[PDB]
Amino acid sequence: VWKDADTTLFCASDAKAHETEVHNVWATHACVPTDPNPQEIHLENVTENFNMWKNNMVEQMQEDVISLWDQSLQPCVKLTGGSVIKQACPKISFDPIPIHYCTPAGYVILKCNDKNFNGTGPCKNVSSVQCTHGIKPVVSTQLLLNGSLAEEEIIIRSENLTNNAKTIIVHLNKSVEINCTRPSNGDIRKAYCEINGTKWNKVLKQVTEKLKEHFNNKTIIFQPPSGGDLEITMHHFNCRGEFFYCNTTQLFNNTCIMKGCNGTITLPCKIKQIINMWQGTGQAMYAPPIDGKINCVSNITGILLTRDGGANTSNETFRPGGGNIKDNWRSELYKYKVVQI
């Protein structure tokens, strides 16, 4: 017997003490070594209720990543309201590593194993674990990168899909590589992201068909964000310590959902020195980019969407979203919850 409960988890990782890479440095001090032989066991006949949207595991991870970024990517100049914070801002080694979250004695983590579990409600095939899988604390908007994949069908996650105010997390079952590059020796800030238009469009078609299941076979339309901060109108992410802003207009291109658009999609990108902080703490200023080839190849494993709505309309329009980085952690922690003995 047990009950739902919240407790201070501890983290584990395979961080290396010799590394100057900032995730390794944080994890070396914050986390314990992983268990080379962890204990997972199926629970014979147990049905437990999960709620990914009300999971305190998400809050703790958010706090850790904020802590990590505070120590690792401190800006040259931080502007928060009416103050100006100057700090050393040397170029550093930046490449996220997987972080496991673990329960202390007296608690355990229940893991949902239903193949098409959407994140809320009952789970019938349940197991208990010591720790979560390795989760890379990748901070991004619009596109979820380097995450896990859904095992069976594409999964549409939402607190309430009929409520258009609630964010949508699309969990892909096949990843699409996005190859971002700031080339070396005009504009040192000019970059670009390359995607296999054939792989992407086919996945986007699958996402469309999956959305039709939930929305009465209505026409599914994709549109770019109509406006707002650059960090959410663009695909915002950090590559090798540099802050990228990529235009995803071409990714959400309904024409390819048969014109000959099976080629390479090249998204225009920009590295910015001045950014709005996802932590909510004003704006940050960094030094101009390092010299040479800046390159990050990532797996697109999920998508953040908002639905326009409309009282009756024949279409449903979706736009890339994100900005609340807690949802990034939710897309990985959705199948876990803490209980007390």
Epitope: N164, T167, G228, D229, W278, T306, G321, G322, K326
Partner: antibody, heavy 129, light 108 residues
């Protein structure tokens, strides 16, 4: 219950500067974008400015043309609108507004698709020589 | 950039009437449209957001409709408190903008 209280209104010479403030209470200030709307005598409502929750970005109506500045102080839940190079046409009642988004999920970032759910009583700015 | 044009400029109504104010955007703004009421002496009051959603506390005698460029606000069973100036507002672009207003006065 949401409460917005403006101050800093009064008289100012054309070409002069004037800062409005809005003290907010009854909600979590750090979570919401905040803005300003004005109405000049005999005219309609006019979109002046909004600043994101994180306070690192602000956007302005077309008439502003680089003259105004916003800032927010999270220690005292106050939003500011600094107005410079004012003209007689800027004479108006200025309203502090709270901004709510149609959609959750943007966190502290400002996004299009929003509405002014709560309004202050407004404060009168008179630009005259 | 986006101009909001309301029609008519003004209209008269009796208690109990139903009136409709229309709002046209110079370009597509989906359902990103809000409606406000303004009476002298008091600040603007939100009525409708997202084209069709009635704001909490507002009488359901108010309803909004439209999607794209053409929108309307309908006031059913007009009451004395409804005699006011009404404004539409797009929030589609980063910078929003208001319509020029439509006022409703008492027919005689």
């Amino acid at each position: 219950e949401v409460q917005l209280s403006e101050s800093g209104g009064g008289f100012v010479k054309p070409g002069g500067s004037l800062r409005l403030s809005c003290e907010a209470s009854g909600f979590t200030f750090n979570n919401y974008a905040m803005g300003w709307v004005r109405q000049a005598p005999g005219k309609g409502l006019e979109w002046v400015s909004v600043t994101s929750a994180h306070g690192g970005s602000a956007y302005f109506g077309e008439f502003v043309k680089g003259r105004f500045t916003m800032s927010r102080d999270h220690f005292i839940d106050t939003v500011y609108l600094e107005m410079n190079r004012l003209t007689v046409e800027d004479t108006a009642v200025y309203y502090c507004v709270r901004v709510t988004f149609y959609h959750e999920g943007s966190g502290y970032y400002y996004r299009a698709g929003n509405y002014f759910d709560s309004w202050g009583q407004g404060t009168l700015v008179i630009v005259s020589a | 950039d986006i101009q909001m044009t309301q029609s008519p400029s003004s209209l008269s109504a009796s208690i109990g009437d139903r009136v409709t104010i229309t709002c046209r955007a110079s370009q597509d703004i989906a359902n990103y449209l809000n409606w406000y009421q303004k009476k002298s002496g008091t600040p603007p009051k939100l009525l409708i957001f997202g084209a069709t959603n009635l704001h909490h506390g507002v009488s359901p005698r108010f309803s909004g409709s439209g999607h794209g460029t053409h929108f309307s606000l309908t006031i059913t069973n007009v009451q004395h408190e409804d005699f006011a100036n009404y404004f539409c507002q797009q929030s589609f672009q980063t910078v929003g903008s208001f319509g020029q207003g439509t006022w409703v006065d008492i027919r005689r």
